Design an enzyme around this catalytic site. Structure first.
Site, PDB file in Angstrom:
ATOM      1  N   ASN A 103      43.242  17.830  61.544  1.00  0.00           N
ATOM      2  CA  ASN A 103      44.122  17.625  60.409  1.00  0.00           C
ATOM      3  C   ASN A 103      45.253  16.656  60.719  1.00  0.00           C
ATOM      4  O   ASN A 103      45.941  16.206  59.803  1.00  0.00           O
ATOM      5  CB  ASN A 103      44.748  18.958  59.982  1.00  0.00           C
ATOM      6  CG  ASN A 103      45.661  19.550  61.064  1.00  0.00           C
ATOM      7  OD1 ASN A 103      45.333  19.498  62.250  1.00  0.00           O
ATOM      8  ND2 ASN A 103      46.802  20.137  60.649  1.00  0.00           N
ATOM      9  N   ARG A 242      55.357  23.906  56.362  1.00  0.00           N
ATOM     10  CA  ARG A 242      55.175  25.085  55.510  1.00  0.00           C
ATOM     11  C   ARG A 242      56.317  25.203  54.519  1.00  0.00           C
ATOM     12  O   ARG A 242      57.473  24.974  54.853  1.00  0.00           O
ATOM     13  CB  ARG A 242      55.077  26.378  56.339  1.00  0.00           C
ATOM     14  CG  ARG A 242      53.893  26.489  57.328  1.00  0.00           C
ATOM     15  CD  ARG A 242      52.532  26.558  56.617  1.00  0.00           C
ATOM     16  NE  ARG A 242      51.473  27.049  57.498  1.00  0.00           N
ATOM     17  CZ  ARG A 242      50.742  26.290  58.317  1.00  0.00           C
ATOM     18  NH1 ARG A 242      50.921  24.970  58.369  1.00  0.00           N
ATOM     19  NH2 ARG A 242      49.808  26.854  59.087  1.00  0.00           N
ATOM     20  N   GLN A 271      52.408  29.339  47.272  1.00  0.00           N
ATOM     21  CA  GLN A 271      51.376  28.314  47.157  1.00  0.00           C
ATOM     22  C   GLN A 271      50.066  28.977  46.763  1.00  0.00           C
ATOM     23  O   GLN A 271      49.721  30.007  47.350  1.00  0.00           O
ATOM     24  CB  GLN A 271      51.221  27.599  48.498  1.00  0.00           C
ATOM     25  CG  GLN A 271      50.483  26.290  48.436  1.00  0.00           C
ATOM     26  CD  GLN A 271      50.681  25.502  49.706  1.00  0.00           C
ATOM     27  OE1 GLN A 271      51.475  24.564  49.744  1.00  0.00           O
ATOM     28  NE2 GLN A 271      49.992  25.901  50.758  1.00  0.00           N
ATOM     29  N   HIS A 295      48.969  20.616  47.750  1.00  0.00           N
ATOM     30  CA  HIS A 295      48.673  20.735  49.178  1.00  0.00           C
ATOM     31  C   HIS A 295      47.316  20.110  49.513  1.00  0.00           C
ATOM     32  O   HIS A 295      46.299  20.782  49.546  1.00  0.00           O
ATOM     33  CB  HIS A 295      48.773  22.208  49.586  1.00  0.00           C
ATOM     34  CG  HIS A 295      48.468  22.468  51.027  1.00  0.00           C
ATOM     35  ND1 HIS A 295      49.043  21.744  52.050  1.00  0.00           N
ATOM     36  CD2 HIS A 295      47.652  23.371  51.616  1.00  0.00           C
ATOM     37  CE1 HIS A 295      48.588  22.190  53.211  1.00  0.00           C
ATOM     38  NE2 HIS A 295      47.744  23.178  52.976  1.00  0.00           N
TER      39      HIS A 295
END
Lengths: 337, 353
Positions: A103, A242, A271, A295
């Site tokens: 990622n 976050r 979220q 996201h």
């Protein structure tokens, strides 16, 4: 093995495409359950594959009911949705593995992108064009270059360091970092970074701050009214770490007040973001300074290809009984940290 | 000395921001300086056409200061009327609004100076920003948020990393090169350039760039193409239907150079049909862009792939500070009679290249 896949053509991490591994698995002789039902199949699932982009909660209860469970795989990076302390406590031989590093480039790119977008005032500039206007002064009055800015990262791990690496050729005044360990000394000189020893000092001198740290007791609600009051007035803030690291209303308040010139990132708390989340509608006094996205930074198609391959590599290590996992992918090895 | 300064009116926006030097309200930060020196400064946004404040003062102006962001066309007919003109300054970079040819061919004793180097970092940043916004599908993503929506799959399906992409520049001058430098740590598959002259090999290797000898074979292999070339006979309408057909299918195209390098409707067509995944940049033709310029409403099959902005990349507040200072430095060189201009700033010196 019975395998339960939880999701939501170079797309892979959706429940229609099945990580591109549906045939890879069936032609190896396994049964694939793919869902978006899961609780029906947990008692006999040998393997559970999840995604941090639509996280199936692997709760205390589900762990209990999973009598065959040997392996949980995160197709991506982030285990927040798995009760790792419980698995550890049970003494059950359940490995938990993720595709570490898959990622990081994607998010690092997103950070730099967001910084440039905020600094250069891109959002209201593009909005002018599509709304059939043209008023250069309205954009230029809050457009800056990233060159000559002091840029600070909270966290200098895989993502934070890659951010710094990408910032070097942009000629910032200085690159700074706060973290719980030193960057290896060679790594530090390669980006010209200077360690700052406390957060308040870090943010006080930064034009741009980027949050690249794990969420824990130390970082939960770290960006609150009080800390924001110590930022440079008119600083830009980016967070792809976050959502819970920020106090949502405090950030919105700082943007409206001019304590921040801009805020951006792709992480929210809660979220997915409620339609009414304050970060959707927050603006600076000029009606801009918002570079929020959903996201997705780590679900680009290139990232997904890495998650798919990495998931296969993990599955092959498991199926063969070689357990020749990459040390960095291991979260739990048979219930052990 | 009489100085005519032609800039845009920023109105309300000039009150908001002291550092917005390049507007008529703020006068490049030089108004008091000029006054203390006894010079007469006429500041105007009125540049068209005949009765204009510019034309009123041309006959006796010693110096005219212009900006690329609201260019006064210093034409042959205006040059002939400007009986006292000794110096034209571009408070920025870009001199296509000035008839250099006429000045040079006549041998008129007029210097033309610009603030070379002051724009380049700004534009280069903007190109990389624009590359990232396009490749990463930022625009429709941000749109979801402000529209109160949330649908990750709708974004992710057309979102890529810039890493592992082939990236080509058309032009490797001051801006094209600084784009390459900024792309290096993003780990593209390869960096390539087309130009009429080679970069030195040390410059090529610093950035891992390979020269491709023609534009067709450049664009054929590039995932991302950026145009960083001056407008001339070799580049006018360069990006047309024919060349676009040769682009890698699903390419992203960035143009921060000159709008007329592209054929507008050809770019719009290639974006709709999927020849390009995205187009972005800050340059237009005509400029300013009409409300109905095709690049405003153009989108790819998904309603995105458009990262256009008005022409501002070189007029960030950081750039304006450099323009204003460089302009003051030029005027000082002139007023003192030193004529100690920076060699790179000189376009013409008393009519000579």
């Amino acid at each position: 093995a019975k395998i339960v896949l939880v999701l939501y053509e170079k797309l892979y991490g959706c429940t229609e495409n099945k990580l591109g591994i549906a045939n890879w698995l069936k032609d190896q002789g396994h049964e694939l359950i793919t869902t978006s039902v899961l609780d029906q199949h947990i008692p006999d699932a040998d393997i559970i594959i999840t995604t941090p982009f639509h996280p199936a909660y692997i709760t205390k209860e589900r762990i209990d009911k999973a009598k065959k469970l040997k392996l949980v795989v995160v197709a991506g990076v982030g285990s927040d949705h798995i009760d790792l302390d419980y698995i550890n406590q049970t003494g059950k031989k359940i490995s938990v593995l993720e595709v570490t590093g898959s990622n990081v480039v994607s998010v690092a790119e997103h950070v730099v992108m967001t910084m440039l977008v905020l600094v250069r005032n891109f959002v209201p500039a593009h909005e002018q064009i599509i709304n059939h206007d043209w008023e250069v002064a309205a954009i230029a009055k809050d457009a800056y270059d990233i060159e000559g800015k002091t840029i600070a990262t909270i966290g200098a791990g895989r993502i934070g360091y890659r951010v710094l690496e990408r910032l070097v050729p942009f000629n910032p005044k200085e690159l700074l970092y706060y973290d719980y360990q030193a960057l290896p000394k060679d790594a530090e000189e390669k980006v010209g970074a200077r360690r700052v020893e406390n957060i308040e000092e870090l943010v006080a001198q930064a034009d741009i701050v980027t949050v690249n740290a794990p969420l824990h007791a130390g970082t939960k609600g770290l960006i609150n009214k009080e800390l924001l009051s110590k930022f440079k007035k008119g600083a830009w803030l980016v967070n792809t770490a976050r959502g819970a690291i920020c106090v949502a209303e405090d950030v919105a308040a700082a943007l409206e007040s001019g304590q921040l010139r801009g805020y951006g990132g792709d992480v929210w708390f809660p979220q997915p973001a409620p339609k009414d989340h304050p970060w959707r509608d927050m603006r600076n006094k000029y009606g801009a300074g918002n570079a929020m996205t959903p996201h997705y930074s780590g679900t680009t198609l290139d990232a997904q290809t890495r998650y798919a391959q990495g998931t296969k590599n993990i599955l092959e290590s498991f199926f063969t009984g070689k357990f020749d996992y990459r040390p960095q992918d291991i979260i739990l090895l048979n219930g052990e940290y």
